[PDB]
Amino acid sequence: NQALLRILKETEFKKIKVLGSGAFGTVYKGLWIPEGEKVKIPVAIKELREATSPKANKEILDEAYVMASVDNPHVCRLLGICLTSTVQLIMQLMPFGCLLDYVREHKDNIGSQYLLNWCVQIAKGMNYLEDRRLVHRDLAARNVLVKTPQHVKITDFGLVPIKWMALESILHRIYTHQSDVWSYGVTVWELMTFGSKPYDGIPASEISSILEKGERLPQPPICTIDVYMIMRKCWMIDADSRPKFRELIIEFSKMARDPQRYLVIQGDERMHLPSPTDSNFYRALMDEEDM
Amino acid sequence: ALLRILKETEFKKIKVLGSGAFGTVYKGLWIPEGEKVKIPVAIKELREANKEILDEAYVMASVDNPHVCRLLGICLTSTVQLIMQLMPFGCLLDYVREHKDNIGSQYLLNWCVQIAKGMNYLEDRRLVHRDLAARNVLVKTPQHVKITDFGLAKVPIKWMALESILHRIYTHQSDVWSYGVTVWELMTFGSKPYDGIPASEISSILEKGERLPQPPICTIDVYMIMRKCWMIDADSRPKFRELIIEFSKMARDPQRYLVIQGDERMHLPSPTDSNFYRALMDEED
Ligand SMILES: Nc1ncnc2c1ncn2[C@@H]1O[C@H](COP(=O)(O)OP(=O)(O)NP(=O)(O)O)[C@@H](O)[C@H]1O
Ligand SMILES: Nc1ncnc2c1ncn2[C@@H]1O[C@H](COP(=O)(O)OP(=O)(O)NP(=O)(O)O)[C@@H](O)[C@H]1O
Ligand SMILES: O=C(Nc1nccs1)[C@@H](c1cc(F)ccc1O)N1Cc2ccccc2C1=O
Ligand SMILES: [Mg+2]
Ligand SMILES: [Mg+2]
Numbered sequence: 001n002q003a004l005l006r007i008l009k010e011t012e013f014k015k016i017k018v019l020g021s022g023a024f025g026t027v028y029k030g031l032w033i034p035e036g037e038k039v040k041i042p043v044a045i046k047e048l049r050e051a052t053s054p055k056a057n058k059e060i061l062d063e064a065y066v067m068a069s070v071d072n073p074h075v076c077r078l079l080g081i082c083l084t085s086t087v088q089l090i091m092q093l094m095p096f097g098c099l100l101d102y103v104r105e106h107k108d109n110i111g112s113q114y115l116l117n118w119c120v121q122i123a124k125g126m127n128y129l130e131d132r133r134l135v136h137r138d139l140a141a142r143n144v145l146v147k148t149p150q151h152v153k154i155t156d157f158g159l160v161p162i163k164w165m166a167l168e169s170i171l172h173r174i175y176t177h178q179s180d181v182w183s184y185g186v187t188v189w190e191l192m193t194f195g196s197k198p199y200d201g202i203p204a205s206e207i208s209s210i211l212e213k214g215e216r217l218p219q220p221p222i223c224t225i226d227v228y229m230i231m232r233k234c235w236m237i238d239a240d241s242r243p244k245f246r247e248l249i250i251e252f253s254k255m256a257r258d259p260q261r262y263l264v265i266q267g268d269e270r271m272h273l274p275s276p277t278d279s280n281f282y283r284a285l286m287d288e289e290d291m
Numbered sequence: 292a293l294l295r296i297l298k299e300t301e302f303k304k305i306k307v308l309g310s311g312a313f314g315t316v317y318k319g320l321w322i323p324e325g326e327k328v329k330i331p332v333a334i335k336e337l338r339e340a341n342k343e344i345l346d347e348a349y350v351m352a353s354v355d356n357p358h359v360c361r362l363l364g365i366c367l368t369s370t371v372q373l374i375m376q377l378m379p380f381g382c383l384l385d386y387v388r389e390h391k392d393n394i395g396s397q398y399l400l401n402w403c404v405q406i407a408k409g410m411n412y413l414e415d416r417r418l419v420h421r422d423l424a425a426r427n428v429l430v431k432t433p434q435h436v437k438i439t440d441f442g443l444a445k446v447p448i449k450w451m452a453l454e455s456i457l458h459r460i461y462t463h464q465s466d467v468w469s470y471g472v473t474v475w476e477l478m479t480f481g482s483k484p485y486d487g488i489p490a491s492e493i494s495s496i497l498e499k500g501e502r503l504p505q506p507p508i509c510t511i512d513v514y515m516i517m518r519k520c521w522m523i524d525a526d527s528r529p530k531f532r533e534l535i536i537e538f539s540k541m542a543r544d545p546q547r548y549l550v551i552q553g554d555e556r557m558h559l560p561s562p563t564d565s566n567f568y569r570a571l572m573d574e575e576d
Pocket of ligand 1: 019020021022023024025026027044091092093094095097098101138140142143145155156161
């Protein structure tokens with residue numbers, strides 16, 4: 001249990017490059033130096049922005065033990081923590097980065113099989129968090145990490161992103177597994193638009209109004225009606241009418257089996273998944289975990 | 292499909308890590324086509340038909356065991372360049388020298404288990420190493436070692452069985468002799484075997500019945516194993532199967548079989564530190 005979270009010393013790791021920043025901290029590429037060893041192992045470090053007290057560290061640790069306890073191929077696990085004045089959190093470094101950036105950078109290189117498999121894998125990860133009764137609260141393509149292009153994992157769960165939130169979260173601060181489904185719908189839309197900004201040009205303060213009026217994110221140019229309808233079902237006002245994560249796995253798996261029937265992409269026939277050869281090569285170098 | 296054919300343009304060597312009797316090993320970077328990442332690899336540039344090389348290279352790509360390094364890719368355009376996983380800890384010989392004050396019996400005995408497991412697997416596949424030595428055991432984590440450079444035949448006199456020196460016979464039972472030398476290397480914390488004796492004289496002193504001396508930390512139980520690896524009759528030597536069993540037995544009571552000062556303090560990592568180690572560096576089964 002708590003043996004899954006390692007307490008680190010200041011002296012055994014170093015930040016080397018700023019990777020980006022979010023609402024609660026700045027993420028660095030760093031290096032772990034095992035005591036008495038000579039190697040420097042790349043990690044990702046999130047240093048929180050606001051310094052905390054010993055008493056607030058007790059809260060932090062309690063959540064830290066939980067996030068360190070997740071075991072699923074499409075869910076990132078928290079690995080260590082350093083209780084400096086500003087607390088530092090250590091997890092595995094994903095050199096491909098987040099899926100939001102990956103889809104933006106390859107928006108001419110991505111075929112239907114990749115996109116549909118990402119949606120399946122993200123649903124798998126969220127379904128697990130639901131089994132653990134862990135509410136993500138901040139799902140978004142920026143919080144899906146690319147371990148290899150064939151393998152993505154959800155991060156920063158269980159801790160405002162108005163444009164990803166369910167209406168009841170905006171209006172009443174209600175966060176459930178069914179509001180996470182709304183955020184999944186927006187995340188999928190992000191992918192299918194290759195990283196467009198949702199409700200681009202609408203002030204965040206006015207989003208609840210347009211949702212109550214029934215306005216929703218538009219149909220991506222590549223999405224058939226079948227895919228768009230799923231996204232729309234994630235955005236129902238009645239949270240219990242939204243699909244469940246298990247249903248989303250079954251449905252996107254069905255589509256991934258005939259990807260070109262459900263996604264219409266120009267040049268889709270020249271981009272396919274990697275040969276068995278190239279996956280085995282990817283796995284032996286970057287991705288040795290079970291699935 | 293287990294051996295990836297690489298183009299020159301998709302990897303770059305950046306730093307020399309060392310050289311041995313068959314090539315130079317470089318720390319390198321793999322750059323996937325159409326991606327922006329740079330993945331560290333180890334590249335061994337050799338020197339000595341491409342389809343033949345490939346055929347043996349395919350065999351080396353086909354090994355599947357947690358204690359045997361797999362050949363991952365190959366580039367045959369100019370020199371033969373072999374691509375495998377980069378082990379930032381380096382080889383076990385250097386590790387034992389650098390940590391010769393921190394290595395306790397539990398680590399030492401478990402390394403002997405793991406090296407035997409890998410060699411037993413090679414025996415199952417009928418692959419003769421021909422160059423086993425502590426320098427050919429890579430440290431993945433301090434807790435996890437793997438045999439490398441098996442099958443590079445495509446001379447370490449002081450690791451070779453007598454019949455290999457005299458008659459060029461290489462079997463799994465001569466690998467056993469080299470396993471015996473490898474274990475002596477570990478238990479001496481990386482000493483050079485038969486130090487100061489020219490290689491030209493090893494065959495003479497073996498025939499005269501001289502063998503490597505008992506490491507100061509080894510009980511007689513452990514030294515007897517090493518001596519059985521060095522019998523002149525190859526078939527009286529133990530099997531890698533038996534070696535797994537005995538070192539496993541000894542690893543269950545490590546301080547009874549190795550006498551190390553302060554050993555009662557140098558225990559294997561806590562579940563916490565292994566879980567942390569494995570998630571960062573060692574996700575395999
Ligand atoms: N484990 C990691 N490995 C590599 N890159 C990472 C890792 N975690 C985060 N990043 C990158 O760092 C960026 C900034 O992290 P973060 O602080 O979580 O902000 P954000 O995810 O973009 N927004 P948010 O978490 O919703 O407030 C991310 O967008 C990623 O590209
Ligand atoms: N995958 C690897 N990762 C890290 N270091 C490595 C790797 N492979 C080999 N090395 C190191 O590279 C150096 C040269 O290796 P190598 O060329 O096989 O020579 P050697 O094993 O020391 N002598 P030889 O018996 O001829 O192979 C040694 O210090 C090895 O430890
Ligand atoms: O560390 C996280 N992200 C990072 N990005 C770069 C390097 S670490 C994030 C997190 C990581 C993970 F693997 C799984 C779920 C997560 O929620 N957590 C955990 C936690 C615990 C207590 C207080 C704050 C945080 C916090 O932010
Ligand atoms: Mg994030
Ligand atoms: Mg070698």
